[PDB]
Amino acid sequence: GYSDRARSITLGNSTITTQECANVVVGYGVWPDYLKDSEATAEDQPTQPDVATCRFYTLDSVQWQKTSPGWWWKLPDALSNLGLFGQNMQYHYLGRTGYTVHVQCNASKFHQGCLLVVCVPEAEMGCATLDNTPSSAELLGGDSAKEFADKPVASGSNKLVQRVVYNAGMGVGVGNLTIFPHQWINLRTNNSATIVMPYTNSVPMDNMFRHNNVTLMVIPFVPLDYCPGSTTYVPITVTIAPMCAEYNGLRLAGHQ
Amino acid sequence: GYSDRARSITLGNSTITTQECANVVVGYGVWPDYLKDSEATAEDQPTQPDVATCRFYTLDSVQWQKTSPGWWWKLPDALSNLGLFGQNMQYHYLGRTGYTVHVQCNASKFHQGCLLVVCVPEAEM
Amino acid sequence: GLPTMNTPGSCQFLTSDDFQSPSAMPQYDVTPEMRIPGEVKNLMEIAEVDSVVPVQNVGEKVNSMEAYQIPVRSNEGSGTQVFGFPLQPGYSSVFSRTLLGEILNYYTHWSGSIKLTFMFCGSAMATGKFLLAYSPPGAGAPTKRVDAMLGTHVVWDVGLQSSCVLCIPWISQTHYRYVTSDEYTAGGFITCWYQTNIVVPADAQSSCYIMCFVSACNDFSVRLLKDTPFISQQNFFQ
Amino acid sequence: GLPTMNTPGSCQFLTSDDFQSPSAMPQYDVTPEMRIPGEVKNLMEIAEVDSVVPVQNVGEKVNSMEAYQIPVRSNEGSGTQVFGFPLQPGYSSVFSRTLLGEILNYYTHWSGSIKLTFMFCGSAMATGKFLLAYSPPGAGAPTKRVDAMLGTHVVWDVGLQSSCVLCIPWISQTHYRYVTSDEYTAGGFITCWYQTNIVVPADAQSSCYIMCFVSACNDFSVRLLKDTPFISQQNFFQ
Amino acid sequence: RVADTVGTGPTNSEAIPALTAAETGHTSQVVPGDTMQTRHVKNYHSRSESTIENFLCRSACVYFTEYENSGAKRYAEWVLTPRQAAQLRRKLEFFTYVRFDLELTFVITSTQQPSTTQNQDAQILTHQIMYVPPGGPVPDKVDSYVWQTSTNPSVFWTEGNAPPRMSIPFLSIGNAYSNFYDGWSEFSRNGVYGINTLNNMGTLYARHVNAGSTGPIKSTIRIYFKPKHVKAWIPRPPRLCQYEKAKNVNFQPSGVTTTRQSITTMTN
Amino acid sequence: RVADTVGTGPTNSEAIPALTAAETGHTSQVVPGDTMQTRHVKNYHSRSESTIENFLCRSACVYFTEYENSGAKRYAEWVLTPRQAAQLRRKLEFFTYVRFDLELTFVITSTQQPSTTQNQDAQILTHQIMYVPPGGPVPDKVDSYVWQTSTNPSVFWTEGNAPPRMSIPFLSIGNAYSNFYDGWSEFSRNGVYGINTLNNMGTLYARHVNAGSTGPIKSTIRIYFKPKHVKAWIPRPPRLCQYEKAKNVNFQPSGVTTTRQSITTMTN
Amino acid sequence: GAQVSTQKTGAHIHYTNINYYKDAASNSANRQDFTQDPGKFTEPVKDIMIKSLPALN
Amino acid sequence: GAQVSTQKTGAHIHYTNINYYKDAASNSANRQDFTQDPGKFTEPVKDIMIKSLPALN
Ligand SMILES: CCCCCCCCCCCCCCCC(=O)O
Ligand SMILES: CCCCCCCCCCCCCCCC(=O)O
């Protein structure tokens, strides 16, 4: 027989194995597919890299401490510099893709904590100064994760993001973030969390540099705790796999 | 009707037009195709970029002078830094491709000369 | 000339009316539709989704993530209380800001059953037993486990599945209740008590947390659309 | 008296309305129709016709026939540029005054593919090769032939047929674009480069001219009729 | 509905869709799948806003004029002619000949004039508008007999309700309204030159039926045209230059277009 | 119609409807007859007021502005944008993308201004409202030629009758109106950030056609939106915080909710 | 071409409607469209979860 | 003698109209006449020109 905890995911030349996992969350009930002819707009023929772009890319790890507000990642920007996915999105004008996000955190039976993993579509964030809009270096940090704050960010004459956590940067209530596709990592039960988000947008394709379709937020609703003698360094790893990625409008390399 | 001098070649998002050309030379009688399963060796699944790699790349021009011995180009190296063809051949270990070479030189009716264009396989120097 | 007669109510602007008007852009080609995930056709598809409840909204705890945590530790006694709040899904501060509460405010009447899911967030070595209870109105709130045991209760045994559900049924004299505070339509009280204790071994934390999620059942309904008393403005935004 | 009720929008004058009105001249015999060549039934029958493009609109050249000439001579080098302009069929000065541009101004949105025909107007002894290119937005404009070769290009060989066509396809994220300047709907860049050189014999002119014609393809469409920002008046004409 | 793109592939042939000859006065009918590889797209766009009926059937102000309830200017006259307003004139001149019905709408509005007269308590004003076809008598004064409108069409309008509106049929002795006329009125090839030769449309007069008040009042009438059931022939290029008069095609020479910095500049 | 409760009895089994696992991101579909004994109830309640069409199809004031019959402010302009009024903005932002027709209603009302001018006897005021799509000319003054509305939609309204009202179709170059946009206008990832990037809706102008009186008068116009035929996707959480500007999502950090005295208190 | 439909009446009569304008954007609002499908949000998992079954087995 | 026709609606409903006046010049505008024929202007030549053929042969 088989169990519901064990689950393997194969994509390209990458295989992810887990022995203690909750059920997979598939978007809004939709599985990522390709753009059809009765829904296309651009007339030329697109290129599908398939195995070279639809595989598991692992990012840097972050440390879960006893006082961590949380982290977020702008999904399209995060992989803009990894393998042939970044190159194809750098040489083309329009792109289209869904995602498979796997978040992993392992600890013992004597550790406790709870992390919320949510894929937020069109997470437009606010600035600490009501006068202006935040910088691109503040909003999206590639090759790294962006950290929330526990206290409100001060105002003034800058372009900082309002990274207060209980407001989620979006100026909402954080406990309602369970309206979007989500999954909880409970250290006494869960081990990892999988989310299979399809392409959400209001146009059939989009430029992948000046627009971020979704965002991965990881927040520890219940803090991490343990007793003296157990491991103190607990990391969190994120692996993203593009799905059904296609590109249209070949041009010179660059983003200007 | 049509003539044998005029000929257009479309590949990817590139179209080559000529109004004074000789018949096309197709290799050793063989048209470039894909690797079949009864002839493959590597077990994993290959990636075919198609339009992004199979298109016309133009190189720099050279000047034909009255005392020019000639020129040559190592075909695979020549495009190793152009578009997504170079990138795919830079991120992968094995590759396979055929070619379509178009050489162009135009002059008037009061010029003269003759150039030999030859695709030499395994030209060890 | 067809002889007609105008009745009271002509040339009036009722904001909730349903007529036909001449189009400003005649014979305009509208952009075709595309398929977008997550199409909504009713507001009760949103209220039927869980959302975390801020039970510990005490003091400065509203300005952190501590509002969502319910602290439960090892107690040298038994039958003491964990939490309690009234069944006022749109008026009480515990419920007025959740997805359910937010949607309820835009309406005057509500009806149906309620789901309260509790997730235990201790270590895998902690064990416990709790007694979730709902008491309909007519008396006060229960002040001991001998008074809460007499209502609609569930005994939650903590282990493996770290999530229990307390369903609050519809026990009313009317078909509908009021979203605003009204004694004639009082809801009741929800409380939680220690059944036995939280027991842990050495080198393990004797203090754990619980989390609460609220949602609506299949029979839930709302009526009388109105304005929400939450949003407000002094001048037009720019 | 049939009892009626008037709704908001009565006794109002919407200039784009469609009703019936009493005739001032009743039972008037209208002159019979005759057959006149060239009946128009759509504005896209006009935009689908070529018209010469003023590419050299530089300085005083707009006050002559030199605006329509693109100078191309023998160059002691290779790969230099002939011309370039953006794909803005109704906003850029290169395109805003042509038949296509003129018709586009009366509308807000456009869609479809574009035709650019080039005619070579040298002597029958001149030979050349050119590289017409279209680059979608996302990077800058190409600054050498190694950057323009990577887009949608055609290699025009000059001889006998003295006319080549570069079709700019619809490569957009939306179904429609804007006729006015808007970054969210940027079109791209059109450039032309020397492929080899213009070669001539003795006693022949080494300087020639090219001409450009713009038109629309079968998929072209327009929306949102508006007023043109070209015509204007201070007082009623007499 | 616009045409749907056909998906194509790579070609190597002696066909030459790109190479053509523009000296034949023929526009090349090349689709994008002739110079590149394409995909099959199902197009659903409509050409329903480019129709001449949709392009021309919108009301436009072609004139407005004033009259008073006392003093000298007691009535207003206007030989009917659309070539006074630039917008509708430039829209129609897209074609050489047109043929349409008309929908007339009038916006009449009064204003009280500054004065020192006291105890002013005005009654509602009624206006009369009268059309005289070419040949009929004209109102030399305000209280003349011509205002009896025994045969002449006319409209009585009391201030305060829906604007007056009528329908006019295609009135022309010819088979179409000529937007341009290259000729003279006399066989001697002198006299009136141009389209003023064919402008025999009648005259429109307007007055107050009652004075209303003891103080001064000025009423302005705005006329709106709206072509219906339009037919058009022989499209022409757009004006480009600015109009000068209403009776002729005179202009001041203007440059082909506006300029830029160089032949390679991507900026206005 | 809502579901009907099923009557149940006493159970002693290894089934566990109450025990679940919330880490799977799945809401438990437990009915009350799973944790207690119930009776059969025939439910007749309807979910007919929770529909998005019923929740959103109600007129709301999105803006109002003033102009005068004399002096400096002779006309009024307003770039169309619903994010100035809090109520309708907060209703729409429940979803990420919407798609609807529009029903516009205008409440124009005049007031007499304090002044020392005498012998004032006003005539009825007529107002003009004009819509300019993005790209067209703008009225630099009050008596400019742009008010001829040859192609631009416009409405003439005389004070005293039913408020003017029109229907607008879904005007968008995209497939849906985006309530939120996480990106920039330029490919250089700098410049305008947020939903102001997609706000290319045109401009609305308003004026008096006649001055009416010799004394001052100020007219205020209130604009009302009413979505019809609504479609919506991807529901979001409610705002909670108070809005600050009309072009961005900026806010001031606020507490999750309001407080009480203890974790056991049954009072606000 | 009149359309006869049913009125919104209580539980435990018809009305007539005619379209006067050729633009479908002028019709009355679509008030009676009582169709709901909460499965996209409440239960979006890949594997089916039987209610009376251990979620983790 | 009512005329029922189709409304202008999007892609991917009917309306009724009656004529009240005996002059055909009073009817509503003919908005839906989507008929185009660009062949009088784009290709007015005497001899047919096949697209994939040398214009001059
Ligand atoms: C009571 C008022 C009745 C008014 C009747 C007006 C009848 C004359 C209409 C003149 C139409 C002129 C159309 C000119 C068209 C053209 O040549 O471009
Ligand atoms: C004569 C007045 C005509 C007025 C015409 C107004 C046409 C523009 C309507 C703008 C609608 C904007 C809808 C925004 C929806 C959104 O993005 O949330």
Domain boundaries, chain D: 1-238
C30 contacts chain H (CB < 8 A): yes
Residue E112, SS3?
strand
Residues of chain E in contact with residue H55, where contact means CB-CB under 8 angstroms, are: 19-21, 24, 26
**Token duo for residue G54:** 């251990």
Distance CA E199, CA E201 (A): 6
Q: By C-alpha distance, which of E59, D110, A167 is closest to F135? A: D110
Residue type (1 letter), C198: I
B2 contacts chain H (CB < 8 A): yes
Q: What is the sign of the dihedral through the CA atoms of F157, F162, F163 and F164?
A: negative
**Token duo for residue F89:** 């903005």
What's chain A look like in SS3?
Answer: CCCCCCEEEEECCEEEEECCECCCEECCCCCCCCCCHHHCCCCECCECCHHHCCCCEECCCEECCCCCCCEEEEHHHHCCCCHHHHHHHHHCCEEEEEEEEEEECCCCCCCEEEEEEEEEECCCCCECCCCCCCCHHHHCCCCCCEECECCCCCCCCCCCECCECCCCCCCCCHHHHHHCCEEEEECCCCCEEEEEECCCCCCCCECCCCECCEEEEEEEEEEEECCECECCCCEEEEEEEEEEEEEECCCCCCCC
Domains and CATH numbers, chain A: 7-250 (2.60.120.20)
The DSSP code for G28 is P
Cα of B66 to nearest chain A Cα, Å: 36
Place of tokens 């480069």: D193
Please check whether residue C208 is in contact with residue C198, taking contact to mean a CB–CB distance below 8 angstroms: yes
Binding site membership of F155 for ligand 2 (Cβ less than 6 Å): yes
The DSSP code for F167 is E
Q: By C-alpha distance, which of A128, A199, A137, A109 is closest to A169? A: A128
Residue of A nearest to E44 (CA): A38
Residues ≥6 apart with Cβ < 8 Å to C9? D5
Please check whether residue E211 is in contact with residue D204, taking contact to mean a CB–CB distance below 8 angstroms: no
Residue D189, SS3?
strand
Please check whether residue C126 is in contact with residue C204, taking contact to mean a CB–CB distance below 8 angstroms: yes
The torsion angles phi and psi of E252, rounded to 5 degrees, stand at -110, 125
Distance CA E7, CA A36 (A): 13
Distance CA B80, CA B88 (A): 9
Q: What does C183-230 look like in DSSP terms, one character per residue? A: GGG---EEEEEESS--B--TTS-SEEEEEEEEEE-TT-EEEEE---SS
Residue D209, SS3?
strand
Distance CA E231, CA D32 (A): 13
Distance CA E97, CA D37 (A): 11
List C-alpha distances in Å: E260 to A161, D141, E38, E264: 41, 17, 34, 9
Residues ≥6 apart with Cβ < 8 Å to F148? E60, E61, E85, E87, E88
Question: Which helix (H) or strand (E) element contains residue D101?
Answer: helix D99-105
Cβ <8 Å between E28 and H51: yes
Place of tokens 């009626």: D4
Residue of A nearest to F23 (CA): A184
Cα of G36 to nearest chain F Cα, Å: 9
Distance CA B56, CA B47 (A): 20
Distance CA H29, CA H43 (A): 31
Residues of chain D in contact with residue F161, where contact means CB-CB under 8 angstroms, are: 10-11
Binding site membership of F177 for ligand 2 (Cβ less than 6 Å): yes
Distance CA E57, CA E49 (A): 11
- Residue C97, sorted as left (phi over 0), alpha (psi -120 to 50) or beta, turns out to be alpha
Residues of chain F in contact with residue E216, where contact means CB-CB under 8 angstroms, are: none
Residue of D nearest to B105 (CA): D196
C211 strand-pairing partners: C119
Q: Which of the residues E101, E102, E233 would you substitute to probe the H interface, choosing the one with the greatest number of H C-beta atoms within 10 Å?
A: E101
Question: Which helix (H) or strand (E) element contains residue F88?
Answer: helix F86-92
Sequence-distant contacts of H27-31: CB under 8 A, at least 24 apart: H27/D20, H27/E228, H27/E229, H28/D18, H28/D19, H28/D20, H28/E228, H29/D18, H29/E53, H29/E57, H29/E228, H29/E229, H30/E53, H30/E228, H30/E229, H31/C26, H31/C27, H31/D18, H31/E51, H31/E53, H31/E54, H31/E57, H31/G22
Residue of A nearest to D148 (CA): A252
Cα of G20 to nearest chain C Cα, Å: 8
Please check whether residue F177 is in contact with residue F157, taking contact to mean a CB–CB distance below 8 angstroms: no
Query: CA angle, F193 as apex, F191 and F198 as ends, to 5°?
Result: 105
Of E44, E45, E54, which is closest to C27 when you measure between CB atoms? Answer: E54
A18 strand-pairing partners: A7
E252 strand-pairing partners: none
Q: By C-alpha distance, which of A208, A225, A228, A190 is closest to A19? A: A190
**Token duo for residue D88:** 């803005």
Environment class of A238 (CB within 10 Å of its CB; exposed 0-12, middle 13-18, buried 19+): buried
**Token duo for residue F66:** 């003033």
Distance CA D166, CA D177 (A): 20
Count other C-beta atoms under 10 Å from residue H42's C-beta: 17
Cα of F169 to nearest chain C Cα, Å: 7
Residue of E nearest to F117 (CA): E114
Question: Resolution in A, one decimal?
Answer: 3.0
Binding site membership of E57 for ligand 1 (Cβ less than 6 Å): no
Q: By C-alpha distance, which of E151, E200, E196 is closest to E171? A: E200
**Token duo for residue F111:** 């007031």
Residues ≥6 apart with Cβ < 8 Å to C34? A39, A203, A204, F175, F176, H12
Residues ≥6 apart with Cβ < 8 Å to E75? E67, E139, E142, E205, E206, E207
Count other C-beta atoms under 10 Å from residue D71's C-beta: 13
Distance CA A53, CA A86 (A): 8
Environment class of A250 (CB within 10 Å of its CB; exposed 0-12, middle 13-18, buried 19+): buried
Q: Which chains touch F (3 or more CB pairs under 8 A)?
A: A, C, D, E, G
Q: What is the sign of the dihedral through the CA atoms of F75, F80, F83 and F86?
A: positive
Please check whether residue F52 is in contact with residue F7, taking contact to mean a CB–CB distance below 8 angstroms: no
Q: Which of the residues G7, G42, G45 would you substitute to probe the C interface, choosing the one with the greatest number of C C-beta atoms within 10 Å?
A: G42
What's D52-66 look like in SS3?
Answer: ECCCCCEHHHHHCCH
**Token duo for residue D4:** 């009626």
Residue E87, SS3?
helix
F228 strand-pairing partners: F101
Domain range for F170 is 1-268
* CA–centroid distance, residue C12 to ligand 2 (Å): 23
Q: By C-alpha distance, which of D214, D220, D215 is closest to D48? A: D215
Q: By C-alpha distance, which of E8, E57, E196, E216 is closest to E125? A: E216
- Angle, nearest 10°, between helix axes A83-91 and B83-91? 180
Binding site membership of F246 for ligand 2 (Cβ less than 6 Å): no
- Residue D188, sorted as left (phi over 0), alpha (psi -120 to 50) or beta, turns out to be left
Binding site membership of E69 for ligand 1 (Cβ less than 6 Å): no
Count Cβ neighbours within 10 Å for each residue of C78-98 and write b for 16 or more, e otherwise.
Answer: eeebbbbbbbbbbbbbbbbbb
Q: Which chains touch B (3 or more CB pairs under 8 A)?
A: A, D, E, H
H4 contacts chain D (CB < 8 A): no
Residues of chain H in contact with residue C32, where contact means CB-CB under 8 angstroms, are: 10-12
Strands of the E75-79 sheet, one edge to the other: E75-79, E203-208, E126-132, E154-158
Question: Given the CA of residue F225, which atom of ligand 2 is nearest to it?
Answer: 11
In chain G the beta strands, taken as DSSP E runs, fall at 3-6, 14-17
Task: Look at ligand 2, atom 4, and give the residue with the nearest C-alpha.
Answer: F131
Please check whether residue F212 is in contact with residue F123, taking contact to mean a CB–CB distance below 8 angstroms: yes
Please check whether residue D199 is in contact with residue D128, taking contact to mean a CB–CB distance below 8 angstroms: yes
Residue of C nearest to G33 (CA): C41
Which of F52, F95, F104 has the most ligand 2 atoms within 8 A of CB, as the residue to mutate?
F104
Count Cβ neighbours within 10 Å for each residue of B60-80 and write b for 16 or more, e otherwise.
Answer: ebeeeeeeeeeeeeeeeeebe
List C-alpha distances in Å: C72 to C81, C166, C196: 10, 18, 12
A52 contacts chain B (CB < 8 A): yes
Chains B and F share 3 or more Cβ pairs within 8 Å: no
Q: Which of the residues H48, H51, H57 would you substitute to probe the B interface, choosing the one with the greatest number of B C-beta atoms within 10 Å?
A: H57
- Residue F140, sorted as left (phi over 0), alpha (psi -120 to 50) or beta, turns out to be alpha
Residue C80, SS3?
coil
Last residue before each break in chain H (C–N > 2.5 Å): 12
Q: What is the sign of the dihedral through the CA atoms of A160, A161, A162 and A166?
A: negative
Please check whether residue F66 is in contact with residue F218, taking contact to mean a CB–CB distance below 8 angstroms: yes
Please check whether residue B83 is in contact with residue B52, taking contact to mean a CB–CB distance below 8 angstroms: yes
Distance CA G37, CA C41 (A): 7
Of D152, D153, D202, which is closest to B110 when you measure between CB atoms? Answer: D202
- Residue A229, sorted as left (phi over 0), alpha (psi -120 to 50) or beta, turns out to be left
List C-alpha distances in Å: C91 to C95, C113, C137, F248, F267: 7, 17, 17, 30, 10
Binding site membership of F172 for ligand 2 (Cβ less than 6 Å): no
Q: By C-alpha distance, which of A138, B84, A71 is closest to F189? A: A138
Strands E154-158 and E217-225: unpaired
**Token duo for residue F162:** 């039913």
Cβ <8 Å between D23 and H21: yes
**Token duo for residue C154:** 């569930």
Count other C-beta atoms under 10 Å from residue G14's C-beta: 7
Please check whether residue F70 is in contact with residue F211, taking contact to mean a CB–CB distance below 8 angstroms: yes
Binding site membership of E102 for ligand 1 (Cβ less than 6 Å): yes
**Token duo for residue C141:** 């709130």
Strands C107-111 and C221-225: antiparallel
Distance CA A192, CA A183 (A): 9
CA atoms within 13 A on the CB side of B117: 9
Which of E177, E196, E230 has the most ligand 1 atoms within 8 A of CB, as the residue to mutate?
E177
Ligand nearest to the CA of E95: 1
* CA–centroid distance, residue E168 to ligand 1 (Å): 7
Strands B14-18 and D152-158: parallel
Count other C-beta atoms under 10 Å from residue G56's C-beta: 21
Binding site membership of D24 for ligand 1 (Cβ less than 6 Å): yes
Distance CA F161, CA D140 (A): 57
